[PDB]
Amino acid sequence: VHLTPEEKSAVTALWGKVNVDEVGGEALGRLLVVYPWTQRFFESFGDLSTPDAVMGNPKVKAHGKKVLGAFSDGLAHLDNLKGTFATLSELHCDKLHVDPENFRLLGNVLVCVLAHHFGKEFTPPVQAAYQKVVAGVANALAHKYH
Amino acid sequence: VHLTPEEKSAVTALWGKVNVDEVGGEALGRLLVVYPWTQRFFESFGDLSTPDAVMGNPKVKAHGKKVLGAFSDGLAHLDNLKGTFATLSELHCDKLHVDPENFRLLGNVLVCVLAHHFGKEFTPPVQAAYQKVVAGVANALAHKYH
Amino acid sequence: VLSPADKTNVKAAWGKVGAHAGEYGAEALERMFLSFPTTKTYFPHFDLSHGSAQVKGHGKKVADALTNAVAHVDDMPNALSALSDLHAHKLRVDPVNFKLLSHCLLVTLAAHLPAEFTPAVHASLDKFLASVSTVLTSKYR
Amino acid sequence: VLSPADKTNVKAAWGKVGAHAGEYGAEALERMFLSFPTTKTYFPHFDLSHGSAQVKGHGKKVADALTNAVAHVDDMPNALSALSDLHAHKLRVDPVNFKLLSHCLLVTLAAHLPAEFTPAVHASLDKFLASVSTVLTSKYR
Numbered sequence: 001v002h003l004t005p006e007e008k009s010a011v012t013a014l015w016g017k018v019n020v021d022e023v024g025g026e027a028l029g030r031l032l033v034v035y036p037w038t039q040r041f042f043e044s045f046g047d048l049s050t051p052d053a054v055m056g057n058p059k060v061k062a063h064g065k066k067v068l069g070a071f072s073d074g075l076a077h078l079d080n081l082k083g084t085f086a087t088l089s090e091l092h093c094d095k096l097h098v099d100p101e102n103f104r105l106l107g108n109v110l111v112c113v114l115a116h117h118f119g120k121e122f123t124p125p126v127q128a129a130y131q132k133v134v135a136g137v138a139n140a141l142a143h144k145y146h
Numbered sequence: 147v148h149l150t151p152e153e154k155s156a157v158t159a160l161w162g163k164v165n166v167d168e169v170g171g172e173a174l175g176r177l178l179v180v181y182p183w184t185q186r187f188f189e190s191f192g193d194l195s196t197p198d199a200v201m202g203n204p205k206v207k208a209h210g211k212k213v214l215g216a217f218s219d220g221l222a223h224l225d226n227l228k229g230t231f232a233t234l235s236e237l238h239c240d241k242l243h244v245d246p247e248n249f250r251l252l253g254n255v256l257v258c259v260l261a262h263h264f265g266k267e268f269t270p271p272v273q274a275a276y277q278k279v280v281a282g283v284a285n286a287l288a289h290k291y292h
Numbered sequence: 293v294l295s296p297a298d299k300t301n302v303k304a305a306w307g308k309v310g311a312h313a314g315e316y317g318a319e320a321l322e323r324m325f326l327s328f329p330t331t332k333t334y335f336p337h338f339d340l341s342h343g344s345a346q347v348k349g350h351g352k353k354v355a356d357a358l359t360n361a362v363a364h365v366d367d368m369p370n371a372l373s374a375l376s377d378l379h380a381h382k383l384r385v386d387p388v389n390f391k392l393l394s395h396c397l398l399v400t401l402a403a404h405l406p407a408e409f410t411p412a413v414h415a416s417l418d419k420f421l422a423s424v425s426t427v428l429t430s431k432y433r
Numbered sequence: 434v435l436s437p438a439d440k441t442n443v444k445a446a447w448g449k450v451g452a453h454a455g456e457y458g459a460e461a462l463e464r465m466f467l468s469f470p471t472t473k474t475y476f477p478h479f480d481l482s483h484g485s486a487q488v489k490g491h492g493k494k495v496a497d498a499l500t501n502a503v504a505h506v507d508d509m510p511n512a513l514s515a516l517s518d519l520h521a522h523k524l525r526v527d528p529v530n531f532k533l534l535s536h537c538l539l540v541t542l543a544a545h546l547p548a549e550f551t552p553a554v555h556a557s558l559d560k561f562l563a564s565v566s567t568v569l570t571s572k573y574r
């Protein structure tokens with residue numbers, strides 16, 4: 001992914017302020033709530049029957065921190081997302097059997113969570129820069145079908 | 147895209163029998179009929195208001211021959227669809243602004259036309275191989291967003 | 293959203309399947325299992341070999357579910373609520389699979405019924421199959 | 434397919450917009466034009482600069498169309514037939530654009546109404562905006 005030095009700075013700035021304990025679990029939680037079919041891949045998590053059970057589930061919160069960390073890794077290596085998500089694209093494609101459309105779904109849910117967390121500070125130019133980042137992450141994770 | 151020597155032969159065999167004058171124009175025609183939004187990209191073609199006007203339009207038929215030829219070029223360079231379709235990818239993504247989901251839509255319409263043309267001879271293993279090729283062609287055409 | 297023409301097109305195309313509804317339903321499943329092997333993960337309890345008694349029997353149910361959906365084209369959320377409980381609540385089928393089955397059903401119809409599979413009918417059945425998919429993959433109880 | 438909870442959730446979330454409908458509608462457009470610049474091709478007649486009188490006025494219509502859609506949630510094909518003719522018959526808008534606008538509308542709601550934007554409401558509005566998009570991108574008359 002290519003980003004302007006002004007977009008690179010706007011992205012790093014807001015990302016430095018991210019609540020590492022909540023944003024990831026919220027993005028994963030909202031993925032499972034908004035797209036209920038995604039709950040099939042997370043059966044080992046137990047109770048995911050209501051939004052309250054999903055958002056308060058410690059496995060969603062802990063795995064969401066892992067997901068957020070993979071996004072952070074992506075942002076630290078924008079110039080090589082393909083290489084960065086090599087083994088991660090393997091695990092999702094060849095072993096978890098996740099339809100890549102879902103990667104685009106989680107990327108947009110994260111953006112919704114960033115909007116929700118940062119409010120008016122998540123401006124249209126800041127959103128646009130994050131759209132390039134999450135599309136890049138979604139695409140790099142899809143790479144094993146490519 | 148990788149294919150088994152048996153799939154490679156089943157694909158070449160059915161493809162050698164393809165009516166070069168009809169299959170492409172039918173695949174493009176059916177794309178425009180089944181997915182009416184695709185008609186926006188083909189405004190210069192004129193009358194595309196009814197299925198009859200679409201299927202009998204000489205621009206659809208002539209452009210469909212071009213499309214079928216790009217697919218044929220694909221089947222001839224399966225090991226390098228990215229290189230083969232790089233410039234075509236440039237055109238669709240950067241000059242025409244075609245959403246990559248449309249490539250998948252056309253690939254599947256072509257398969258429907260092959261099923262329609264070959265009937266019982268378009269067997270489930272023959273379809274499966276053609277699915278690898280059309281997924282490979284759509285993906286290669288989507289490469290400029292990747 | 294199905295237009296009057298679509299509903300008329302679907303009834304006439306599906307009505308032509310007749311007795312072979314189960315066979316086209318079984319072939320659409322086999323086409324899906326071959327072309328898209330990830331769909332097989334939804335059926336670990338199934339013998340998915342060729343000429344399978346489970347795939348043949350399952351193909352009949354799928355085609356009868358589609359028949360019932362044709363006969364209640366204006367009332368699918370009520371007529372298909374049980375199959376929505378099944379695919380959306382219990383099975384949590386990723387809707388991408390419904391696109392692949394639909395496509396395989398269209399491919400089967402294209403192969404066996406060429407005279408009926410016109411561009412207009414293809415358009416109408418694709419719209420009917422997407423609407424059916426939306427209902428079976430949605431939680432609306 | 435909207436569940437009873439969804440329709441209820443949408444009415445309460447959208448009803449909290451009220452007076453600030455046009456502005457959130459204008460911001461969702463600006464978010465779409467920035468993040469997805471290909472959507473701009475549908476508006477060559479528009480001044481798409483910041484604080485645009487055309488984007489502000491268009492955002493009001495989009496939000497009023499959504500208001501009308503909320504008030505006729507069980508009858509959108511009839512209540513939105515004029516807009517379906519506009520986006521499906523005349524404009525032939527690729528449905529991918531509806532996904533991007535919907536997302537941008539969700540992003541705008543998430544930013545300005547955090548207390549209302551719960552996971553349940555997010556789910557319900559996404560289903561609503563997907564239902565509306567289907568109606569505006571379908572040819573059904």
Ligand code: HEM
Nearest residue numbers: 038041042066067070071096098102103106107137138141
């Ligand atoms: C594009 C965004 C995504 C990222 C960055 C992401 C990241 C990750 C990471 C970092 C892991 C842990 C790998 C490890 O075991 O060390 C993981 C695991 C997994 N992911 Fe994803 N993922 C994404 C999307 C998805 C989606 C959309 C699904 C399915 C809906 C999914 C399903 C899973 C599952 C089931 C596991 C296994 C975790 C477990 O053992 O319970 N992921 N993901």
Ligand code: HEM
Nearest residue numbers: 184187188212213216217242244248249252253283284287
């Ligand atoms: C993945 C399958 C596709 C292939 C192989 C394909 C192939 C081609 C080829 C070979 C050309 C001519 C390039 C030249 O000007 O020398 C072309 C042009 C074009 N394609 Fe595609 N195409 C595909 C999908 C699409 C889709 C889905 C759309 C939009 C719905 C589209 C829209 C166009 C348009 C508008 C042109 C310009 C032709 C003109 O000048 O009227 N193509 N395509």
Ligand code: HEM
Nearest residue numbers: 331334335353354357358375378383385389390393424425
């Ligand atoms: C329009 C598309 C579809 C229709 C009409 C349909 C219809 C049915 C019907 C009628 C049943 C019988 C269950 C009963 O008698 O209560 C069924 C079962 C099932 N369907 Fe679907 N289905 C469709 C798509 C799918 C897809 C796309 C998948 C996943 C790839 C799927 C997976 C299943 C599974 C796993 C069962 C249970 C099988 C068993 O235990 O024997 N279905 N479906």
Ligand code: HEM
Nearest residue numbers: 472475476494495498499516519524526530531534565566
């Ligand atoms: C839920 C989503 C949407 C709704 C409710 C919506 C609503 C509207 C409404 C109410 C109008 C006013 C036209 C009139 O007064 O007759 C309109 C115009 C229009 N819409 Fe949409 N729209 C939506 C999505 C889109 C999308 C995604 C695009 C393309 C990116 C688009 C492009 C247009 C264009 C080009 C016009 C005409 C603009 C003008 O001439 O001033 N719309 N839309």
Ligand SMILES: Cc1n[nH]cc1-c1cnc(N)c(O[C@@H](C)c2cc(F)ccc2-n2cccn2)c1
Nearest residue numbers: 293294365366423507508509510511564567573
């Ligand atoms: C959203 C959405 N997407 N797709 C269909 C809907 C939908 C929404 N609200 C309705 N009230 C509705 O009613 C049905 C009976 C209907 C009425 C029409 F006016 C036109 C066509 C359908 N038709 C029947 C089956 C398929 N589409 C249908």
Ligand SMILES: Cc1n[nH]cc1-c1cnc(N)c(O[C@@H](C)c2cc(F)ccc2-n2cccn2)c1
Nearest residue numbers: 366367368369370423426432434435506507564
């Ligand atoms: C296909 C399809 N996809 N999405 C909605 C449809 C659909 C099809 N046929 C109907 N007759 C229909 O009727 C509406 C009134 C409806 C009845 C329900 F039973 C449940 C929910 C809706 N509901 C209202 C708005 C959205 N969904 C809705």
